[PDB]
Design an enzyme around this catalytic site. Structure first.
Site, PDB file in Angstrom:
ATOM      1  N   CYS A  80      44.444  40.283  51.301  1.00  0.00           N
ATOM      2  CA  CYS A  80      43.148  39.689  51.618  1.00  0.00           C
ATOM      3  C   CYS A  80      43.276  38.796  52.838  1.00  0.00           C
ATOM      4  O   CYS A  80      44.265  38.073  52.997  1.00  0.00           O
ATOM      5  CB  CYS A  80      42.603  38.862  50.444  1.00  0.00           C
ATOM      6  SG  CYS A  80      42.069  39.852  49.048  1.00  0.00           S
TER       7      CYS A  80
ATOM      8  N   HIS B 150      36.270  33.950  48.804  1.00  0.00           N
ATOM      9  CA  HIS B 150      36.675  33.945  47.392  1.00  0.00           C
ATOM     10  C   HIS B 150      38.037  33.278  47.190  1.00  0.00           C
ATOM     11  O   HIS B 150      38.656  33.363  46.134  1.00  0.00           O
ATOM     12  CB  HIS B 150      36.635  35.364  46.785  1.00  0.00           C
ATOM     13  CG  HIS B 150      37.712  36.286  47.262  1.00  0.00           C
ATOM     14  ND1 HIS B 150      37.462  37.333  48.126  1.00  0.00           N
ATOM     15  CD2 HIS B 150      39.033  36.355  46.959  1.00  0.00           C
ATOM     16  CE1 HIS B 150      38.590  37.987  48.361  1.00  0.00           C
ATOM     17  NE2 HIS B 150      39.560  37.412  47.667  1.00  0.00           N
TER      18      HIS B 150
ATOM     19  N   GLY C 157      47.501  40.317  47.855  1.00  0.00           N
ATOM     20  CA  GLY C 157      47.813  39.347  48.894  1.00  0.00           C
ATOM     21  C   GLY C 157      47.470  39.765  50.308  1.00  0.00           C
ATOM     22  O   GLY C 157      47.696  38.986  51.236  1.00  0.00           O
TER      23      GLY C 157
END
Lengths: 301, 301
Positions: A140, A41, A138
């Protein structure tokens, strides 16, 4: 002596963390050999990622390994992860594998922001395929992992926070743990259970450390335990679980099914203001391997 | 979201751990520049270490940095640590300092066996200058540390386990924390207290994470709190402690002394089977800095 939520030394993994930027999205990536893995993503613009990925070109992906920029020469999609082929192989690449873990198993998490490591903590894959992690925007792309002598077994990549505050993500081939997806839906966590075999390993760790107020004279068969377990939302105990607890049963001289009778009593009565290993709750995030590692002496490198 | 006992990434420190052998004693050492630091009870043969150290020569100290052997060209004693000058400077030496911490402050521990790192966990220096660590034979010489951007602040070296199972050691200049010595005596830990300012920082962390069942309408002055604190074996709360909690008071809109009234009620009533941040006990091993770090986003490297 002592018993702590211990995580694996994280150096081998710190050397693989990079920052990946495309569009106005920034997250963390894992750099092994000449591939950078990261959640998909990150790509531009309810989705349809094969569509969006044919829209980009290599030069849209900014990959920062420290100060050094890394040149993306190819890309592809593996389920919910993206693989960005770069022109440099990571000199700090450790011996590694990609392995998928079972609910009940533990791993360490190296939480990361902008490719910079922030902290390291230990945790478990809940029976409903979430993890009770600690993550801010952040994070991820941060990965979870185990270490076995010198080999890094990567098992998790972080993707999203769920409504209740727990976390969900994938293995390193991009297949999610649990029934979650990387798009905005109403997805929620299923109802969780307590990892019975882990609670018993923790009780052995207390005994090995001098807490014994909770044992008992009684005993029980596997069937009558599980009758009580199910009542308190505990996983079922299998004959294999009894086998895995064997070594710990030997080391202490408490029969596995004796320890169960003790857990039965604990569940039925509570703790009466006492604590075990510094906890007023029964802890289920230590496996039998974890306990043997922390009470016998096993290292890595 | 989420809240975990987090430790600093440990890579920078793993690169400095070595193995030190003399006689039939083996323990861990810290290799910075061209010095190796390690506990002095590694030397041969009720002691008198200036005596025993003039008996040895450089060639008695076997120093193993991985497979590579390191050549000891000089030695000296700094209080309860030994400094072994070697002929090679550690290429992996990070920017570092030696700093001594105050009771109540936290650090990370890289537990080590035979110079090989085993695990990493977070902990606090108890008010009686012990730490509730996790250590097995051969963990002597493992160090504790904090990390501030790129700089490694070394604050602890592990020396011994005490009768109750807690641990004692020194700063990196060799001065012990607490009234303990590196010889066999009857030494025991003083009676401990609970780190009040840390419990309040933890309560703020729960509020920031959606636990609010424990707040209250009430308030209290600093004096009437401390009257109740002392009763339950809690450290005194100082005006400075109130100042340090300020930012956390602002972020949540609960006045510091309002949170105290809530802690008062918690101490007086217990928890009634509820939990805070997954704990049924009040946790005192998170500082105000720790909480701000884990609920704002601060990284290192």
């Amino acid at each position: 002596s002592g018993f702590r939520k211990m995580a694996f030394p994280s150096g081998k993994v710190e050397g693989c963390m990079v920052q990946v930027t495309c569009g106005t999205t920034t997250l963390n990536g894992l750099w092994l050999d000449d591939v950078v893995y990261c959640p998909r993503h990150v790509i531009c613009t309810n989705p349809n990622y094969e569509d969006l990925l044919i829209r980009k070109s290599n030069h849209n992906f900014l990959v920062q390994a420290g100060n050094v920029q890394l040149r993306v020469i190819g890309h592809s999609m593996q389920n919910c992860v993206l693989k960005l082929k770069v022109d440099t192989a990571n000199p700090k690449t450790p011996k590694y594998k990609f392995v998928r873990i079972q609910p009940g198993q533990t791993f360490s998490v190296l939480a990361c922001y902008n490719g910079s490591p922030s902290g390291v903590y230990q945790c478990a894959m809940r029976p409903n395929f979430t993890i009770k992690g600690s993550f801010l925007n952040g994070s991820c792309g941060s990965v979870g992992f185990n270490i076995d002598y010198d080999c890094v077994s990567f098992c998790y990549m972080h993707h999203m926070e769920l409504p209740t505050g727990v976390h969900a993500g994938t293995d390193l081939e991009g297949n999610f743990y649990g029934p979650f997806v990387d798009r905005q839906t109403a997805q929620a966590a299923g109802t969780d259970t307590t990892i019975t075999v882990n609670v018993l390993a923790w009780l052995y760790a207390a005994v090995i450390n001098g807490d014994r107020w909770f044992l008992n004279r009684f005993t029980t068969t596997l069937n009558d335990f599980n009758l009580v377990a199910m009542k308190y939302n505990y996983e079922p105990l299998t004959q294999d679980h009894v086998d895995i607890l064997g070594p710990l049963s030997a080391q202490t001289g408490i029969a596995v099914l004796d320890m169960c009778a003790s857990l039965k009593e604990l569940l039925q009565n509570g703790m009466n203001g006492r604590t075990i290993l510094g906890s007023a709750l029964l802890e289920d995030e230590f496996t039998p391997f974890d306990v043997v590692r922390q009470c016998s002496g096993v290292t890595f490198q």
